[PDB]
Design an enzyme around this catalytic site. Structure first.
Site, PDB file in Angstrom:
ATOM      1  N   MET A   1       0.840  -1.187   0.000  1.00 31.89           N
ATOM      2  CA  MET A   1       0.000   0.000   0.000  1.00 31.89           C
ATOM      3  C   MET A   1       0.876   1.238   0.000  1.00 31.89           C
ATOM      4  SD  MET A   1      -3.209   0.566   2.479  1.00 31.89           S
ATOM      5  CE  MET A   1      -2.391   1.551   3.776  1.00 31.89           C
TER       6      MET A   1
ATOM      7  N   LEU B   1      -6.187   7.099  -2.086  1.00 32.76           N
ATOM      8  CA  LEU B   1      -6.857   6.077  -1.300  1.00 32.76           C
ATOM      9  C   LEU B   1      -8.384   6.234  -1.305  1.00 32.76           C
ATOM     10  CD1 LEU B   1      -5.421   4.709   1.964  1.00 32.76           C
ATOM     11  CD2 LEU B   1      -7.822   5.479   1.982  1.00 32.76           C
TER      12      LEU B   1
ATOM     13  N   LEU C   1     -11.489  -0.265  -2.587  1.00 35.68           N
ATOM     14  CA  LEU C   1     -11.369  -0.100  -1.149  1.00 35.68           C
ATOM     15  C   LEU C   1     -12.644   0.469  -0.522  1.00 35.68           C
ATOM     16  CD1 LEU C   1      -9.643  -0.287   1.354  1.00 35.68           C
ATOM     17  CD2 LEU C   1      -8.469   1.816   0.666  1.00 35.68           C
TER      18      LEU C   1
ATOM     19  N   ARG D   1       0.631   1.218  -3.818  1.00 39.48           N
ATOM     20  CA  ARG D   1      -0.731   1.438  -4.266  1.00 39.48           C
ATOM     21  C   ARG D   1      -1.181   2.896  -4.222  1.00 39.48           C
ATOM     22  NH1 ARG D   1      -4.560   1.629  -6.778  1.00 39.48           N
ATOM     23  NH2 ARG D   1      -6.436   0.304  -6.828  1.00 39.48           N
ATOM     24  N   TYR D   2      -0.806   3.628  -3.174  1.00 43.46           N
ATOM     25  CA  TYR D   2      -1.244   5.015  -3.039  1.00 43.46           C
ATOM     26  C   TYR D   2      -0.180   6.122  -3.000  1.00 43.46           C
ATOM     27  CZ  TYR D   2      -5.416   2.294  -2.000  1.00 43.46           C
ATOM     28  OH  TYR D   2      -6.452   1.395  -2.084  1.00 43.46           O
TER      29      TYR D   2
ATOM     30  N   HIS E   1      -3.954  -5.826  11.447  1.00 43.93           N
ATOM     31  CA  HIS E   1      -4.874  -4.757  11.083  1.00 43.93           C
ATOM     32  C   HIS E   1      -6.292  -5.312  11.080  1.00 43.93           C
ATOM     33  CE1 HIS E   1      -6.702  -1.311   9.289  1.00 43.93           C
ATOM     34  NE2 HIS E   1      -5.544  -0.731   9.026  1.00 43.93           N
TER      35      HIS E   1
ATOM     36  N   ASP F   1       8.400  -1.492   9.573  1.00 41.85           N
ATOM     37  CA  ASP F   1       7.789  -0.466  10.395  1.00 41.85           C
ATOM     38  C   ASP F   1       6.946   0.428   9.505  1.00 41.85           C
ATOM     39  OD1 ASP F   1       8.445  -0.677  13.249  1.00 41.85           O
ATOM     40  OD2 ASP F   1      10.532  -0.507  12.587  1.00 41.85           O
TER      41      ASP F   1
ATOM     42  N   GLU G   1       1.472   2.309  11.698  1.00 39.73           N
ATOM     43  CA  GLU G   1       0.750   1.411  12.591  1.00 39.73           C
ATOM     44  C   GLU G   1       1.608   0.862  13.736  1.00 39.73           C
ATOM     45  OE1 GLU G   1       0.613   1.181   9.180  1.00 39.73           O
ATOM     46  OE2 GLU G   1      -1.308   2.240   9.136  1.00 39.73           O
TER      47      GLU G   1
ATOM     48  N   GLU H   1       0.844   4.135  16.352  1.00 43.67           N
ATOM     49  CA  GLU H   1      -0.251   3.463  17.040  1.00 43.67           C
ATOM     50  C   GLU H   1       0.213   2.545  18.174  1.00 43.67           C
ATOM     51  OE1 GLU H   1      -3.096   1.593  14.406  1.00 43.67           O
ATOM     52  OE2 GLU H   1      -4.320   1.006  16.124  1.00 43.67           O
TER      53      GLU H   1
HETATM   54  C1  LIG Z   1     -13.142   8.088   9.382  1.00 40.42           C
HETATM   55  C2  LIG Z   1     -13.125   8.514   7.939  1.00 40.42           C
HETATM   56  C3  LIG Z   1     -13.687   9.932   7.849  1.00 40.42           C
HETATM   57  C4  LIG Z   1     -12.950  10.951   8.697  1.00 40.42           C
HETATM   58  C5  LIG Z   1     -13.547  12.329   8.613  1.00 40.42           C
HETATM   59  O1  LIG Z   1     -14.768  12.475   8.486  1.00 40.42           O
HETATM   60  O2  LIG Z   1     -12.708  13.276   8.695  1.00 40.42           O
HETATM   61  C6  LIG Z   1     -13.986   7.615   7.043  1.00 40.42           C
HETATM   62  C7  LIG Z   1     -13.882   8.060   5.567  1.00 40.42           C
HETATM   63  C8  LIG Z   1     -14.248   6.810   4.717  1.00 40.42           C
HETATM   64  C9  LIG Z   1     -14.564   5.739   5.784  1.00 40.42           C
HETATM   65  C10 LIG Z   1     -14.476   4.274   5.383  1.00 40.42           C
HETATM   66  C11 LIG Z   1     -15.413   3.970   4.174  1.00 40.42           C
HETATM   67  O3  LIG Z   1     -16.741   4.335   4.406  1.00 40.42           O
HETATM   68  C12 LIG Z   1     -15.332   2.480   3.832  1.00 40.42           C
HETATM   69  C13 LIG Z   1     -15.643   1.559   5.034  1.00 40.42           C
HETATM   70  C14 LIG Z   1     -17.122   1.628   5.479  1.00 40.42           C
HETATM   71  C15 LIG Z   1     -17.439   0.719   6.659  1.00 40.42           C
HETATM   72  O4  LIG Z   1     -18.808   0.821   7.056  1.00 40.42           O
HETATM   73  C16 LIG Z   1     -16.547   1.095   7.842  1.00 40.42           C
HETATM   74  C17 LIG Z   1     -15.103   0.963   7.391  1.00 40.42           C
HETATM   75  C18 LIG Z   1     -14.720   1.892   6.228  1.00 40.42           C
HETATM   76  C19 LIG Z   1     -13.244   1.557   5.900  1.00 40.42           C
HETATM   77  C20 LIG Z   1     -14.842   3.387   6.590  1.00 40.42           C
HETATM   78  C21 LIG Z   1     -13.926   3.742   7.768  1.00 40.42           C
HETATM   79  C22 LIG Z   1     -13.969   5.244   8.188  1.00 40.42           C
HETATM   80  O5  LIG Z   1     -15.205   5.555   8.768  1.00 40.42           O
HETATM   81  C23 LIG Z   1     -13.632   6.124   6.968  1.00 40.42           C
HETATM   82  C24 LIG Z   1     -12.155   5.951   6.610  1.00 40.42           C
HETATM   83  C1  LIG Z   2     -10.520  -0.258   6.410  1.00 37.82           C
HETATM   84  C2  LIG Z   2      -9.597  -0.334   5.231  1.00 37.82           C
HETATM   85  C3  LIG Z   2      -9.381  -1.806   4.946  1.00 37.82           C
HETATM   86  C4  LIG Z   2     -10.704  -2.514   4.669  1.00 37.82           C
HETATM   87  C5  LIG Z   2     -10.575  -3.980   4.371  1.00 37.82           C
HETATM   88  O1  LIG Z   2      -9.534  -4.591   4.647  1.00 37.82           O
HETATM   89  O2  LIG Z   2     -11.603  -4.499   3.822  1.00 37.82           O
HETATM   90  C6  LIG Z   2      -8.265   0.393   5.495  1.00 37.82           C
HETATM   91  C7  LIG Z   2      -7.338   0.337   4.254  1.00 37.82           C
HETATM   92  C8  LIG Z   2      -6.473   1.634   4.279  1.00 37.82           C
HETATM   93  C9  LIG Z   2      -6.937   2.360   5.559  1.00 37.82           C
HETATM   94  C10 LIG Z   2      -6.776   3.884   5.639  1.00 37.82           C
HETATM   95  C11 LIG Z   2      -5.286   4.301   5.443  1.00 37.82           C
HETATM   96  O3  LIG Z   2      -4.444   3.712   6.388  1.00 37.82           O
HETATM   97  C12 LIG Z   2      -5.155   5.827   5.541  1.00 37.82           C
HETATM   98  C13 LIG Z   2      -5.730   6.417   6.847  1.00 37.82           C
HETATM   99  C14 LIG Z   2      -4.898   6.039   8.083  1.00 37.82           C
HETATM  100  C15 LIG Z   2      -5.443   6.613   9.376  1.00 37.82           C
HETATM  101  O4  LIG Z   2      -4.652   6.227  10.490  1.00 37.82           O
HETATM  102  C16 LIG Z   2      -6.878   6.128   9.586  1.00 37.82           C
HETATM  103  C17 LIG Z   2      -7.686   6.576   8.377  1.00 37.82           C
HETATM  104  C18 LIG Z   2      -7.198   5.977   7.046  1.00 37.82           C
HETATM  105  C19 LIG Z   2      -8.112   6.607   5.956  1.00 37.82           C
HETATM  106  C20 LIG Z   2      -7.301   4.416   6.988  1.00 37.82           C
HETATM  107  C21 LIG Z   2      -8.746   3.939   7.171  1.00 37.82           C
HETATM  108  C22 LIG Z   2      -8.898   2.386   7.094  1.00 37.82           C
HETATM  109  O5  LIG Z   2      -8.221   1.780   8.149  1.00 37.82           O
HETATM  110  C23 LIG Z   2      -8.405   1.913   5.723  1.00 37.82           C
HETATM  111  C24 LIG Z   2      -9.297   2.502   4.628  1.00 37.82           C
END
Ligand SMILES: C[C@H](CCC(=O)O)[C@H]1CC[C@H]2[C@@H]3[C@H](O)C[C@@H]4C[C@H](O)CC[C@]4(C)[C@H]3C[C@H](O)[C@]12C
Ligand SMILES: C[C@H](CCC(=O)O)[C@H]1CC[C@H]2[C@@H]3[C@H](O)C[C@@H]4C[C@H](O)CC[C@]4(C)[C@H]3C[C@H](O)[C@]12C
Ligand SMILES: C[C@H](CCC(=O)O)[C@H]1CC[C@H]2[C@@H]3[C@H](O)C[C@@H]4C[C@H](O)CC[C@]4(C)[C@H]3C[C@H](O)[C@]12C
Ligand SMILES: C[C@H](CCC(=O)O)[C@H]1CC[C@H]2[C@@H]3[C@H](O)C[C@@H]4C[C@H](O)CC[C@]4(C)[C@H]3C[C@H](O)[C@]12C
Ligand SMILES: C[C@H](CCC(=O)O)[C@H]1CC[C@H]2[C@@H]3[C@H](O)C[C@@H]4C[C@H](O)CC[C@]4(C)[C@H]3C[C@H](O)[C@]12C
Ligand SMILES: C[C@H](CCC(=O)O)[C@H]1CC[C@H]2[C@@H]3[C@H](O)C[C@@H]4C[C@H](O)CC[C@]4(C)[C@H]3C[C@H](O)[C@]12C
Ligand code: FES
Ligand code: FES
Lengths: 359, 359
Positions: free
Chosen positions: A12, A28, A34, A100-101, A199, A276, A279, A283
């Protein structure tokens, strides 16, 4: 001297500097594989901009950026050096990083590989355990690149889409765990509880049949058997974000729970990462091991070193590619089976892309 | 002649006749270790009564009763026959069945073991993969029996609280899978998709740290490795009931999902059971393999035979006990670590009961 076999290391990725954060988030939030968002082309850049400040801060807290590229590069270099000797017939080898991103993007890597005129191309995901959101998306990216560049590949493709129990991978984790146990006070070695932390995934993804949880569990069992179950453990999950249901138990809540129950000597193990990243450096090390740990009155909390530069990990990479070439594998048997409840039409197309490759 | 070593085989059990259904449910709804309900002493008998007709009908559809006791007895006999030759120092050996919700009850068994004046007592759970709601509750019953009878045990106790990856258990599954594959039309053998089906758990239990999911996953990995990944697979969960969130994907939905996606040759594997039960003969064979399968347009759906009377399984049991005695194990290292979010005060006490055992 001209590169013959290219090894595309898929990951990623992470922002190298604070300035790279915004685009990282943007790419992303634009990835349909995703997530699917309302008016995505408009919200994607908006959400990215609103999260950039907070995410830039997290990276500043760990020194200013992600070390993923550095570690990936060193691992690739060791891998290549070993492959040129292990498999002269496929040498010279050359590794390409396909993030990826962030740069170098998967698309830029493929483009470079095509220009280098390689004979063999191997999609080597760097996630030992398969998840449709990580490896799947990365593999989808390769299929979409050609399907969009309007021309078939000029190299023979194949993929190492997963490797959750490779013996050298397990050994690396086991070795790091042992040396870390040695760092705990002698009086508490036996009392140490091991929290394997991977994760987390939203339950909506787990319920459609994602392979991740089960494979991560396999790596854990493999590591513990090698350790001869010297300490008790539990597999927990980190990085949950949002209000939706995710696969638990949560790593943070588990740490807090253990403390409130008298288990104040914890060892965290980043079982699903190869280097590393935010995360682990933020975290797990800062958010949980510094702040949370204090509030809970922990006695000793440590984290096994990430694989990073361990020479054994590079050997693992080399062994995987080598054995992949020798067996003529186009992909794991597992990739030929999509999630029972998969609703993304590209998954089946990506599978066929690889299962159908010439050679 | 007189019995020296007693092996307590723990299992929930099932009603042997339709008439046993009511009390079976009654005992189950009264178990605080399994669930806590408001005014539980009043609701338990009430719920038992309202579910009895439907559950009796289920058992009628499979022949009128549960085969758990018959299979457990046969397995115990084979186990004993072997132990008397494998471990002469501990012979004669005797097996005792300790069902949690039907006769012979766990308490009745312990009572009989005492009366036989045994020197050694081994609590041998028949759930290879540990769950606090199954093996945990059964072990809790043993501690409570002595704590409530106001007397210390007269035998030396110990427990084999889990064995998710014992090589003979694995071979048994692998063997039954292979011969079941031979029952599919040759033309479709390679197209077969394997659905490992385990009993699901409510997410509330999963999120508190229940060991179950991770261990089941280990069994699956070991089996697939022994099968050299001949077919693709996925680990799914069955028996969800109620409207609350449970760990998925669900077996029924996965079967349906696979069909509408073109995978119509499915092999089901009851990876978390040791013998046939209503979960296999009714849920999987009738509910899914007949009804659901028909409506979905499946071409071929089969289920690997349950371990039941396979002589290799009895061997597995005997070798487990043998090794357990040889090593002086009181319990697994895993039992010494309770769930990070455990809220049942008896769990810690049960753990101590075994870890503190004399000898
Ligand atoms: C927390 C963040 C929005 C932060 C903000 O409003 O600033 C939102 C934006 C898109 C969201 C993601 C997307 O909606 C895709 C996934 C939806 C699932 O219902 C939860 C996980 C899920 C992976 C979401 C996690 C989280 O709530 C995200 C990452
Ligand atoms: C939830 C999703 C994985 C879903 C899955 O495995 O199906 C993961 C993939 C990449 C992640 C995102 C990326 O790590 C980028 C952001 C990292 C921040 O610490 C949280 C929001 C953040 C936007 C993450 C939200 C969420 O945990 C994501 C969207
Ligand atoms: C509706 C959608 C989740 C859809 C789903 O998978 O169910 C969620 C995911 C991220 C959400 C957005 C992010 O949280 C960022 C913004 C947060 C504000 O409080 C509302 C607008 C805002 C722009 C949200 C709109 C909406 O609730 C989004 C787009
Ligand atoms: C409230 C409690 C669950 C509490 C919890 O897990 O937090 C649930 C568990 C079983 C439920 C009961 C059972 O479903 C049996 C009955 C069903 C009826 O529709 C309502 C009354 C009824 C008697 C239910 C009352 C209540 O909703 C109970 C007692
Ligand atoms: C959900 C629970 C296991 C919880 C856990 O692992 O923490 C299991 C253990 C025994 C199960 C019950 C027993 O099998 C008896 C009943 C069987 C019926 O087919 C469903 C209701 C029924 C009442 C089951 C409900 C639920 O699936 C139970 C209660
Ligand atoms: C479905 C059944 C009630 C049937 C009826 O009233 O006809 C109820 C009675 C008690 C319930 C169980 C208990 O409330 C204990 C558990 C509560 C969790 O939130 C779900 C699983 C859980 C294991 C429940 C499963 C199911 O909803 C049960 C078994
Ligand atoms: S979401 Fe898993 S194969 Fe498509
Ligand atoms: S609920 Fe798991 S140890 Fe108590």
């Amino acid at each position: 001297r001209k590169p013959k076999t290219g090894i595309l290391m898929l990951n990623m990725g992470g922002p190298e500097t604070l300035g790279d954060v915004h685009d990282f988030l943007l790419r992303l939030f634009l990835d349909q594989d995703l997530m699917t968002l309302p008016i995505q082309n408009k919200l994607a850049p908006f959400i990215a901009k609103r999260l950039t400040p907070k995410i830039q801060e997290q990276y500043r807290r760990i020194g200013g950026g992600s070390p993923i590229k550095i570690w990936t590069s060193k691992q690739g270099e060791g891998m290549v050096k070993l492959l040129d000797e292990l498999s002269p017939n496929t040498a010279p080898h050359k590794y390409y990083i396909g993030f990826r991103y962030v740069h170098p993007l998967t698309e830029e890597a493929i483009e470079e590989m095509e220009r280098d005129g390689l004979e063999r191309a191997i999609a080597f995901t760097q996630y030992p355990q398969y998840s449709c959101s990580t490896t799947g998306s990365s593999l989808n990216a390769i299929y979409r690149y050609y399907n969009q560049v309007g021309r078939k590949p000029t190299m023979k493709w194949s993929t190492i889409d997963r490797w959750p129990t490779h013996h050298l991978l397990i050994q690396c984790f086991a070795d790091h765990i042992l040396k870390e146990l040695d760092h705990f006070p002698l009086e508490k070695r036996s009392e140490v509880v091991i929290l394997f932390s991977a994760h987390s995934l939203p339950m909506s993804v787990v319920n459609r049949g994602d392979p991740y949880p089960q494979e991560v569990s396999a790596t854990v069992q493999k590591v513990m058997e090698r350790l001869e179950y010297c300490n008790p453990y539990r597999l927990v999950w980190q990085s949950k974000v949002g209000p939706m249901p995710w696969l638990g138990p949560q790593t943070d809540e588990s740490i807090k729970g253990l403390c409130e129950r008298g288990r104040k000597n914890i060892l965290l193990v980043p079982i699903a990462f190869t280097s590393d990243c935010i995360e682990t450096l933020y975290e797990l090390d800062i958010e949980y091991s510094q702040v949370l740990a204090k509030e809970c009155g922990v006695e000793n909390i440590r984290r096994a070193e990430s694989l990073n530069g361990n020479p054994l990990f590079s050997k693992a990479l080399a062994d995987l590619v080598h054995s992949h070439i020798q067996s003529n594998e186009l992909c794991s048997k597992q990739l030929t089976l999509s999630c029972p409840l998969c609703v993304n039409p590209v998954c089946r197309e990506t599978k066929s892309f690889f299962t159908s490759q010439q050679l």
